[PDB]
Write a protein that binds this ligand. Structure first.
Ligand SMILES: *[C]/[C]=[C]/N1=C2[C]=C([C])C([C])=[C]C2=N([C][C]([O])[C]([O])[C]([O])[C]OP([O])(=O)OP([O])(=O)O[C][C]2O[C](N3[C]=NC4=C3N=[C]N=C4[N])[C]([O])[C]2[O])C2=C1C(=O)[N]C(=O)[N]2
Ligand SMILES: NC(=O)c1ccc[n+]([C@@H]2O[C@H](COP(=O)([O-])OP(=O)(O)OC[C@H]3O[C@@H](n4cnc5c(N)ncnc54)[C@H](O)[C@@H]3O)[C@@H](O)[C@H]2O)c1
Ligand SMILES: [Mg+2]
Lengths: 1212, 112, 56
């Protein structure tokens, strides 16, 4: 039996002093990074003057010397230019030239281009938009482009099509790539090699998602090395061409979490390529990628440079990124490695290509700081400082200064001085971008310094995959290439010395003013929770010890009544991934003590309600600080008790911290003396988010002034008991928060107890239906229904069309379906693939499936942990075998023998024929796949809605028409565009669904606290200037019937309604997070009086709903001669169960009438209904008798606006 | 400029639909598109699909896409003013069909 | 000013749209009110003309 966390994340090798100094700088404050870089980058006034003159001379040459001319000749708008290039791209996909010209002449030019050209013409329009406009739009307005294409063809005919085709052919065959194949690229390299340039070839491709794709990239590199080495023909590593590789192309799990696989499987592949480069004596450069791959790549560089089989060859090269805070320390490590190995490492200094992505990633992960600078000028100073370090070590490394910035170039040219020989150092540039600049550098007639051109190689399909990066770079106002073209910027501004500009700043190295540190994402509202960097060796080493120590603690959970801990039946709590690992002990609550706890809560309710809301919120904030400080220990418990990986557990604790701080702030924004608490609230929580949802419900209830009976899931009582301990330490009195461990009997006994004033339930729909039935008997002392928040299961779909990027889709599907072994309510259950791309994506998906590591979760390398119990395993497996028995194709990962000691289900893909093949939620790692024809998209959305669930939903598309269509027709609470559908963030994606998925209001949203008090407050930002027009028609109808008071109340409801609220919530860069209020659907009205009916109808119509009115009320004659607009919204129901599903209900009557109706409503099939009831007298006295908060439906939508490959907003 | 009802047939003078009325085949005006698809059009297309009216369902989907209903633009003009231009439904269209297929095509155009 | 703007606007809209498949109707009769005696007069005529129609 392995000791817990004994092998959590051991580093590849012991960290040397030089390696440790790299790690120490990972997220160093920007003000601390800059001063040493300023000093190292300082040059004499003579040199600065000479560099400025050289820079000015280069820039004057640049300014003194395609698509734009085409746009001009045919008077094209921007959209027409983009549409034309998309058409040209499509026509070039026709291989035969004569066939293409015939299609152009006879079919395209003469009329309908649409009739002749499963994939939108405009799939790559974001790229062409960058080419035409210099601006990035993350999605494509495909209806605008279609109109523009029709317009331009009808106006200009075949000549403009011919010119667009020839332009696209030149750009895609000669400008974006040096050649389509390595042979073609080598042929086209001779011209500039004869002038003194050299080449490094980049076999374009995506990062590997599968073993097969990594093997394909390997054979592509190997074949390119042969062609390059044959062409090099003994010219050597400086004069002759070389190759550049990206490590992520060569292994599908290139990450620190999979370090052992990287060293075991990726390293030999790089070695084999390096051995071939050695035999031909060409350069082989390792390109630099995301910041969390930097230090991992150093372990590969170390082993390769120490491997005697590669000795005698100085061609191994390595990129370092000057925008990274570790860059000078990385260079110290590399220079020392070069000395130790005796290999003259070729070091390519770049500024860095992932800037926007690094900012977004650090914010999402809640880390202390960025791993890159945030002011562009800091990167420039870093680059020059690092060049000074490299130029002092040319005996042991070969510096390669990759830049298109003439000021950067000039500064280094003069820094390097007058002594030069080929092999001392070189410059580098990108094909088709740097030739103008370096034609003023290479050659005895210029500066007589060599330049190596980085040459992309690949077909048109491969090039379009990630061309947005370079184009977005050259279009950013900070980019030299953009500024060199901007007439509004002078040469003086372009030759400004960044070293002296930074030195003279009032605070040297201050963070960019307009970029939020992750902790400050929400500004003054609240402090963001902090995460942990699992790529940081210091963090991993510290976490290893804290996690081990957490496994040595004697975790217990006891019935913590107001009077003290109670005795009960005690049993062990076992690790679901290894039942030999005893995590702790739980004493469960007798039904007698559960009922006693409710009585003690009722007795203590006045004392807790009298704690002012601000001080209740202070308790929540103190609990958040405690959980943040205790996160490492909490991680260890969650990992072992609940089957979570370290990443899952960090997200779990962060979410609890965010709940505490969000509900505290929402309290400070809203709660006053008139928002009286309900009374004792029973909080019943699921096993699968055993700290986050547990904490969220309890915190909300407590901060609203209610004492809480906390009933955690029987599977996960320990982390629950620890959360209660933290809340009590933070100042929640024992009488206000009682913990009652146990199974559903304890939950049921709490729900049924006389003094229970409200219930907050998260769990299965079936259990919620049992609680709904138990509460249907019950009324408050005021004679009103006991409020129930019931947040339940999902049957969550993702729709993928042929414009989506397969690698992006597969990553988001793998994460959404199999993270936490599918044991998220948000998990992806049904993937819907457009038929034209289904086979390719499915093959990639199955390949990615088999790269997952399943096992006990106290190892960083484990991706997918166990299912929670043997019963859950049996239920999931029964479903899989039923599907297999029907002949459906089933793909499963093989499980390791070690899983036998726990309860594991392998990640599984099941190919279905129809969405109706699924019956109920299968809460496990089981992804179902269905295919659809594009014309059937609307019917597919119907099919998704038809399950009756409505929790999470994903859409992958680049096409605005498809976004608008799908998002307007889908009925789900949490929408996600071009991203995964999991990990909703508190106050950013307020979380919760509709139908069988929930009553609402959403947890982590602004309507939540208002449900836990007798009179709901007005939430922040909660209003709408829009008035429902059917409500307005009804108010006029009422005035025509003489019902003057009801017409006034109807108009007031129309104004009070927040239907149409449409907000963007603050969050991370690279994402737009939207929150909107919609109609719920059809509301069941059960009136008793005419005026009651009018008030009910006004409330329902003002919030956008239709209604079904109880025909047994006998009030038909009160609604004669309705306007057709109102009649369209009104039906009469004799059999309520036949006319559903409803989305809520309004009831009028005395207490016993309300009780009877509530029993009838609870018996309706399908979704739990949020019921509001009032007496006739209450309707007359209280305009808010029916609260409009609960008659609208919240919808959250999260759009990944970086999905096109970059962040347009941050480029400015 | 131009109105509806007793005030005009349209298209508006000084607007982008105007010239297209004065030729036998109207062009696609500048900026004339919409990403929104009428939901009743979508339901009509599915109904046509179920009946096997394949040409008509295709015509309906094409009308749904090329319709500029929902266009909502800000036009360039002076500072201190916002000048908006939007395309709404006309209202109720009189349909005078002769054949079943003609009626389906008329319905597609009107619903879209 | 309005007459000038009609002229230049329909000129530009023509440059943005009209090609060989956008055939003219033929003779167009332009009947105008007294109250905008140059602006609407010019606008209707200019549009019909630039669309390729002779005007009465
Ligand atoms: C595959 C890969 C590749 N590589 C390379 C190579 C070569 C030869 C070259 C030339 C390049 C490359 N890359 C890219 C780089 O990095 C960059 O990006 C470019 O180059 C640009 O730079 P330049 O020319 O220098 O320009 P400028 O303009 O001067 O600059 C720009 C830059 O900056 C920065 N930023 C911006 N913004 C900002 C910044 N920072 C801070 N803050 C702020 N706000 C950035 O960086 C930009 O970019 C590459 C490579 C590799 O390998 N890796 C990488 O990463 N990259
Ligand atoms: N909508 C959401 O936000 C959300 C979030 C997480 C999980 N869920 C759902 O939760 C389910 C998985 O969690 P689970 O397995 O712990 O759910 P569950 O329904 O099996 O149990 C949830 C809680 O109800 C209690 N319970 C069982 N019977 C009860 C009864 N008769 N009366 C009162 N309480 C009773 C349990 O002890 C537990 O504390 C999934 O269906 C998942 O989709 C929903
Ligand atoms: Mg259960």
């Amino acid at each position: 039996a392995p000791a817990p966390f004994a092998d959590f994340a051991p580093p590849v090798r012991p960290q040397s002093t030089l390696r440790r100094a790299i790690t120490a700088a990972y997220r160093r404050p920007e003000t601390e990074c800059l001063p040493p870089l300023v000093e190292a980058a300082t040059q004499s006034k003579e040199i600065r003057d000479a560099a400025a003159s050289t820079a000015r001379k280069l820039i004057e040459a640049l300014r003194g010397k395609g698509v734009e001319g085409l746009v001009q000749e045919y008077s094209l708008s921007s959209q027409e230019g983009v549409a034309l290039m998309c058409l040209a791209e499509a026509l070039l996909r026709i291989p035969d030239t004569a066939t293409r010209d015939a299609l152009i002449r006879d079919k395209i030019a003469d009329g309908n281009w649409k009739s002749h050209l499963s994939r939108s013409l405009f799939v790559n329009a974001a790229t062409w938009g960058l080419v035409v406009t210099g601006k990035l739009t993350s999605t494509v307005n495909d209806r605008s482009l279609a109109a523009a294409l029709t317009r331009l063809i009808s106006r200009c005919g075949e000549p403009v099509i011919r010119r667009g085709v020839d332009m696209a052919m030149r750009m895609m065959g000669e400008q974006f790539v040096t050649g389509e194949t390595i042979r073609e690229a080598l042929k086209r390299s001779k011209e500039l090699e004869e002038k003194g340039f050299s080449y490094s070839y980049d076999m374009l491709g995506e990062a590997a998602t599968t073993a097969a794709d990594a093997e394909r990239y390997y054979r592509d590199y190997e074949s390119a090395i042969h062609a390059i080495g044959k062409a090099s023909a003994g010219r050597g590593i400086y004069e002759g061409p070389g190759i550049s590789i990206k490590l992520s192309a060569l292994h599908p799990r290139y990450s620190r979490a999979q370090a052992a696989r990287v060293m075991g499987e990726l390293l030999p592949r790089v070695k084999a390529l390096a051995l071939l480069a050695k035999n031909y004596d060409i350069g082989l450069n390792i390109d630099a990628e995301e910041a969390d791959r930097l230090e991992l790549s150093l372990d590969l560089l170390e082993v390769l440079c120490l491997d005697g089989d590669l000795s005698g060859w100085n061609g191994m090269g390595f990129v370092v990124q000057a925008y990274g805070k570790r860059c000078p320390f990385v260079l110290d490590f590399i220079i020392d490695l070069a000395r130790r190995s005796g290999r003259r490492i070729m070091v390519r200094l770049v500024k860095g290509a992932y800037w926007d992505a690094e900012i977004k990633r650090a914010q999402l992960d809640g880390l202390a700081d960025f791993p890159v600078f945030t002011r562009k000028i800091h990167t420039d100073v870093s680059y020059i400082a690092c060049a000074a370090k490299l130029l002092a070590a040319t005996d042991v490394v070969f510096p390669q200064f990759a830049t298109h910035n003439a000021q950067t170039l000039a500064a280094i040219y003069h820094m390097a001085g007058k002594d030069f020989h080929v092999g001392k150092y070189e410059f580098q540039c990108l094909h088709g971008m740097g030739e103008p600049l370096y034609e003023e550098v290479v050659g005895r007639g210029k500066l007589d310094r060599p330049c190596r051109i980085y040459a992309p190689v690949g077909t048109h399909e491969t090039l379009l995959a990630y061309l947005v990066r370079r184009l977005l770079e050259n279009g950013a106002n900070s980019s030299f290439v953009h500024r060199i073209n901007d007439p509004k910027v002078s040469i003086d501004e372009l030759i400004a010395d960044p070293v002296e500009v930074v030195r003279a700043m009032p605070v040297v190295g201050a963070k960019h003013d307009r970029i939020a540190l992750p902790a400050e994402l929400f500004g003054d509202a609240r402090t963001n929770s902090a995460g942990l960097d699992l790529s940081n060796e210091e963090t991993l080493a510290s976490l290893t010890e804290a996690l081990r120590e957490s496994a040595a603690m004697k975790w217990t959970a006891l019935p913590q009544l107001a009077t003290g801990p109670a005795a009960g039946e005690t049993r062990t709590v076992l690790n679901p991934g290894d039942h030999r690992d005893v995590v702790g002990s739980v004493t469960e609550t007798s039904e007698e003590d559960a009922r006693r706890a409710v009585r003690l809560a009722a007795d203590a309710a006045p004392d807790w309600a009298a704690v002012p809301p601000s001080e209740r919120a202070a308790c929540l904030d103190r609990a958040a600080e405690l959980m943040q400080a205790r996160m490492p220990t909490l991680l260890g418990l969650i990992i072992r008790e609940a089957g979570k990986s370290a990443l899952n557990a960090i997200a779990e604790v962060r979410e609890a911290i965010d709940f505490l701080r969000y509900y505290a702030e929402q309290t400070r924004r809203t709660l006053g003396p008139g928002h009286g608490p309900l009374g004792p609230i029973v909080c019943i929580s699921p096993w699968n988010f055993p700290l986050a949802i547990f904490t969220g419900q309890i915190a909300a209830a407590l901060v609203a002034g209610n004492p809480v009976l906390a009933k955690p899931a029987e599977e996960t009582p320990l982390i629950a008991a620890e959360g209660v301990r933290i809340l009590r330490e933070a100042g929640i009195p024992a009488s206000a928060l009682q913990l009652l461990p146990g199974d559903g009997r304890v939950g049921a006994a709490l729900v049924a107890a006389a003094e229970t004033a409200g219930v907050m339930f998260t769990g299965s729909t079936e259990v919620a239906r049992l609680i709904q039935a138990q509460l249907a008997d019950r009324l408050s002392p005021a004679g009103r229904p006991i409020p129930l928040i019931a947040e339940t299961g999902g049957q969550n779909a993702m729709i993928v069309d042929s414009s989506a990027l397969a690698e992006q889709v597969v990553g988001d599907v793998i994460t959404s379906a199999f993270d936490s072994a599918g044991q998220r309510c948000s998990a992806l259950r049904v993937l819907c693939l457009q038929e034209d791309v289904a086979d390719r994506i499915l093959t990639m998906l199955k390949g990615a499936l088999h790269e997952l590591h399943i096992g006990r979760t106290d190892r960083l390398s484990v991706d997918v942990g166990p299912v929670i119990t043997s019963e859950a395993k049996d239920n999931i497996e029964k479903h899989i075998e039923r599907m297999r028995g029907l002949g459906r194709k089933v793909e499963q990962i093989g499980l390791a023998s070690e899983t036998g000691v726990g309860t594991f289900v392998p990640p599984t893909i099941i190919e279905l024929e129809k969405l109706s093949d699924l019956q109920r939620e299968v809460f496990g790692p089981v992804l179902h796949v269905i295919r659809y024809r594009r014309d059937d998209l609307d019917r597919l959305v119907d099919d998704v809605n038809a399950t009756g669930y409505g929790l999470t939903f994903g859409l992958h598309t680049r096409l605005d028409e498809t976004i608008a269509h799908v998002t307007s027709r889908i009925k789900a609470g949490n929408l996600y565009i071009n991203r995964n559908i999991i990990g909703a963030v508190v106050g950013v994606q307020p979380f919760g669904g509709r139908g069988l998925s929930g009553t609402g209001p959403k947890a982590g949203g602004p309507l939540y606290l208002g449900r836990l008090v007798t009179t709901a407050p007005v939430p922040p930002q909660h209003s709408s200037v829009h008035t429902d027009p059917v409500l307005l028609d009804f108010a006029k109808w009422l005035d025509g019937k003489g019902a003057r008071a009801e017409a006034e109340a109807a108009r007031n409801a129309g104004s009070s309604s927040a239907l149409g609220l449409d907000l963007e919530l603050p969050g991370p860069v690279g994402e737009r997070n939207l929150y909107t209020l919609h109609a719920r659907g059809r509301i069941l009205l059960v009136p008793a009086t005419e005026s009651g009916l009018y008030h009910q109808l006004a409330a329902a119509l003002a919030t956008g709903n239709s209604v079904a009115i109880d025909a047994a009320s006998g009030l038909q004659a009160s609604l004669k001669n309705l306007p057709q607009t109102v009649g369209l919204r009104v039906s009469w129901s004799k059999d309520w169960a036949a006319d559903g599903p409803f989305a809520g209900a309004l009831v009028e009557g005395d207490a016993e009438r309300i009780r009877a109706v509530n029993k009838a409503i609870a018996a309706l099939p399908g979704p739990l209904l949020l019921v509001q009831a009032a007496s006739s007298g209450e309707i007359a006295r209280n305009p808010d008798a029916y609260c409009l908060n609960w008659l609208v439906e919240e919808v959250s939508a999260s759009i990944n606006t970086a999905a096109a490959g970059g962040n347009a907003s941050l480029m400015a």
